[model samples]
Target chain A: HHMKEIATEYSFIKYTELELDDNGSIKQLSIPNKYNVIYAIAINDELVYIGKTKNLRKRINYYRTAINRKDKDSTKSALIHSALKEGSKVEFYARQCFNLSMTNELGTMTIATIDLEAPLFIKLFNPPWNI
Target chain B: HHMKEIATEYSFIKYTELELDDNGSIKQLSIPNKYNVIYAIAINDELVYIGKTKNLRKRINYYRTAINRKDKTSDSTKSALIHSALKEGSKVEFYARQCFNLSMTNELGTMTIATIDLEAPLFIKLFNPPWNI
Candidate 1:
């Protein structure tokens, strides 16, 4: 499927504006207008994963870079890498972010979407010629 | 470590009452007066794990039984068994159960208490349980 069609099938709602922070970090421009902001990680119009986050900017930032190896070292990066390799696109749908603790509920939703059988990968050195 | 002190240290506040349902299933006695209920799974005088639940009865029910093998078949049973074998007790400290989703946050608290280096028991029957590598 074409990238445009894939993007159109899924909705990307940005309720809060995006702005830069004093530390040069990107921050949400405004408070969320609703309670839950849903985001989709899709490949060719098929939704591979869906998640809700209180801080969309910070959560999205995790996916924008390589997975942190020093932390728990979850397999989230391998999953994302495979999706991108398959031409997957990350789409957003924002709602009013609520103060209520929805972290676990959101985790339930996110884990439900995860493909657990995906192969795990570790960081490896690449030849200079490849660069 | 005294069991009484352990129990007292970890409060078991049963806020909502306990009632039996028409279907014979046990139900919370009353509506939760607050938002989040904190429970403790402790061994002797030490608190092994702490958690908050939306439905205290339902969440606690999971630990009351032998565990449903048809489900995810989590290591929860093994963990609980080991605790029980060590004389650990389950205690409840209830608060008003809130509607906001705090499930993941609760998991973080629970996982933080897991002993990663504990030996796996499935080895004699199935595969060798992978301990912390």
Candidate 2:
């Protein structure tokens, strides 16, 4: 048996995907790191926003409150900040990594590294909030 | 230092945050692996999406092409990316951690410990990664 297509089998969706969502918060389980991390905001299964900070714990906690406090006009925060009012249902995802960190600090990579990753990530994600 | 009140002191953003986005490609870089990994997408410094894949290289490659491919106007693909995953200068970045094969989980806690050490569950529990669904 020979294969013509390089791509043999593929499914855009993952099976275990559902079981995971039905469960919990990236903030609660993630290791509390002072630097290097990413976070996302989802409303109605729609990925409305995303971001990163050197301090994952700090950033999320800040925005979590900031978003809730107010997005009253342009004077306050922007975009997603407004959703914080009703606080209806918003899901957030956060990821932390030390790859780009200096080697001595239990990490690796450099400024050059993140440069590349950022664009590829932006291109892949396409955030409306980015505007 | 008693760790102090973590909530008390912190900045809204980072100094280098500016430097990273001003630079290059998350896709041009990141390693391609078929294990465990988490990826994030930032547009104009605003992060719009995050995802993980057993196959890091494969997933990004698929989406890169998925986002820019002119030949494939597949409606479903277009519709899927309608908002969550669309933006200019959309940079894709990933942090990959290797994990022990699921088969090795019960057999060896050590491998389980070696476990990509990556936390897809952490993020999934928080954000509903459209790609995951």
Candidate 3:
């Protein structure tokens, strides 16, 4: 479930404009200064992909690399690019697993986003770009 | 990279003795064990299925359930195939890599690995077993 409806203005991936440049290129993106997030990419309010990352900015940047190159081999990036080019409202939703702490033989253990992603994928079975 | 292998013996799950006496029905299984594991289901020494689990015994028991029920869903396909193989007088065995440790420095970055990272993807890539896809 996408919990919050925070505005696009508050997005981590930053850009000067939404429209394409004169060279028919989307502009370079400003790196996100966040970490350990379970994020969703949606188009026209339809949930497309659910993924988790420890290095948030680099992960999103990889998607940037794929989309800009019009990469067909990377299914997730290709799909995301297709939707955006068709004027669909592409959105990013993030949920941080707050206070993800537990006790174990080694004392306090911190839960990473990796711990949450698989179960989340299983629960939401039909996220189109998951494969 | 022989980082790890199954350090335990093959725990043969007895399909022959699992039935109830009255109607030949399958019994419920509650394997009281806990180990975050990557296990292989092998038939006649050939690896057929590779999977990872937070609880090793429960996951193997789950495959046992699927085989008994003869469920034909996408996930149960592995069980169905294994059932056929077992009925042909083939030997079935369970092997697992339960203990793991890794720390490495590389050009890409410091490569930290998880239990699943060691067994699940690496083994699949290496073997490409029939039941995996």
Candidate 4:
């Protein structure tokens, strides 16, 4: 497949881990600043979790903070910690699913990408970390 | 977990394969004749598909017919893939669970939570069945 086809057909991008400053704040982040996207927390291209959020950066921060602080929501932290314990490089992958506007019998219809594709990816991958 | 409490919890039944008639139709299908339930298809205990239907028997029969006739719908493709697995000596298993009421309470308040049908989506979310796609 052509590079353009590969990029368009498979939109999931392997995101590099965040680099934080000495003050414990994100200094460098490399991800599309798009809303309403689906992301997978993967290890070696094997998807472990699939989630959708209106803000990608905030959602990823939640997981990072939970793992760092051992927060009340122990489920996600436990899974991520367990994987990291094996000395594996945990990674994140994301795909931006844009909304589609179309004309139909019921008049103009705007389909939210997350509502449409999140379930499809979740069903397709069956990520072990998703509960 | 308490035995009674555990016993009262949600349940799933693992069904043995059918005993077929000489004509290759089901003679005895070892599943409840009840309607409206969730089911999973597994290969060596790994869930490959999750589904919900109003009529379980008819739904299973549809897959059987689809595989036998090599039908053309998207579901038929799934059926063909599963059938190919069966021919390759895989044990294709069946499991099912009934629906129930959902209620919740806390220090804040108590109320009946919205009824969930034990829908196919939840099962698909949990099991990540490859056949579902």
Candidate 5:
């Protein structure tokens, strides 16, 4: 349930949970689709960062492996960075879903759109990672 | 419930859900005079530390806040250790035995011993936090 028109922004994670196939939605879609996985890192009760991207796979691996570093300014991410440098414990919260579309010449090219929720999450959480 | 035990023992945290209020046996017997409120810290499924003491009021907070700074060693005898662990942990939790020794004149002393007696076995039974040592 997105807070498209509602005053209170709710979690997309619940929606993702309800829809993602326990059998593995990525594999199940069999769609070679473009989708985005939104993620957040929390340090105990404090928000470390709010990020949304299509390159979620790459980001996940990056944060998990990047230790002993901190973002130079904003928009730079590191996992060991947050845990060791910023006192973050690596508790991750995330949400994702797939969208489908087709291009006539491309023969049903799977597609997705940019859902601008990062700003909203940053507003709500006031994450230190977002500059 | 304990991530605070074993060689690198941490804390008595990671409990699913615990009630430290009147709903518990500890609370029901709460004469509230000289009781102790033990504390625990947890982060990312690992226990950070465990402490048994008086005036809990976030015993973990003291240790955690002192992290990376060694000046506040007076807070606990093991200041350096607590600072490091608390600096690393994510969340803080509290558990304790609210005790009153009505039978003893040394109520504070009695509860202190009682607190240790209770916390020692309890910590062993559930967890072994590195901060415990």
Candidate 6:
């Protein structure tokens, strides 16, 4: 019944559930669709990190990968991974029907403008994943 | 002695005091120097507004101008102006030694990237002053 609902809402995409090996533990995630774009935020009551992705599945996968590794490439990734590992409760929202090219350009422009005018307290960091 | 120190520290600029007409009330401001670039932040303990300026003198002047005017041109400008007018205490940092052109370009690029990422909040609005319209 639930699968039927998922299929109806996200008609063009597929849903999948996967369990990842988190160090010595098993972590589970449910991807609702083949999201071509994603925006993620990492917050800890005080500080927040904001990022965007072209592939929601791959980007989320990277977070899972970094969680099990001892050394991570980017500070933003490591921070986000640590938050998830500590059971910090990561929440994500995905959009599947948007044009990738238009969204990507919009995303780039948004980041640049915000960084240029962002408040001193809100530090803007580069995306962890390679674009 | 302190005055001499201040003069030496900001040798190319002059500090002045002015009283503003804030809706029948008088408010005072201290401009440290003729700043070429100014970065301002408006925070209400949670959400924040960030902005930059090529002409700190004129930009800050605009804030003061909009504060007294009943009708404002832009949303961003009005928000910043209202915050300052209401004694919300707008904090400004200025740079005098930098070239305005390079700094403006850097500021433009930063805003563009942050906005495009979809991570920037949707409430973002255009600057009060029209540029590249």
Q: Model 5 segments beyond 4 Å from truth?
A: A1-9, A12-35, A55-57, A67-82, A85-88, A104-111, A123-126, B1-133
Model 6: residue B85 alpha-carbon error in angstroms: 74
Two-way lDDT contest, 3 vs 6, winner = 3
| DockQ of every candidate | 0.15, 0.01, 0.02, 0.01, 0.00, 0.01
Per-model TM-score versus the true fold = 0.25, 0.30, 0.37, 0.37, 0.29, 0.26
TM-score of chain B of 4: 0.65
Model 6 lDDT, full chain set: 0.38
Tens-digit lDDT string for candidate 6 (B1-133): 1223323453312223223355533344555434333232222221133334445566556655565566655444543444454454433222222212211233113121222223112213432222111
Off by over 4 Å in 3: A1-19, A67-73, A98-110, B1-133
**Residue A98, model 3, lDDT:** 31
Give the fraction of reference interface contacts each candidate recovers.
0.38, 0.00, 0.00, 0.00, 0.00, 0.00
Angstrom error of the Cα, residue B83, model 3: value is 72
lDDT of 2 at A54: 60
In candidate 4, how many Å is residue B67 off?
71
lDDT rank order: 4, 3, 5, 2, 1, 6
A12: Cα error in model 1, Å = 5.9
Q: Residue pairs in steric clash, candidate 3?
A: none
Chain B TM, cand. 1: 0.36
lDDT of 4 by residue, A51-104 (tens): 888777777767666656733565775565555656555666667665545432
lDDT of each: 0.38, 0.39, 0.56, 0.60, 0.43, 0.38
lDDT of 4: 0.60
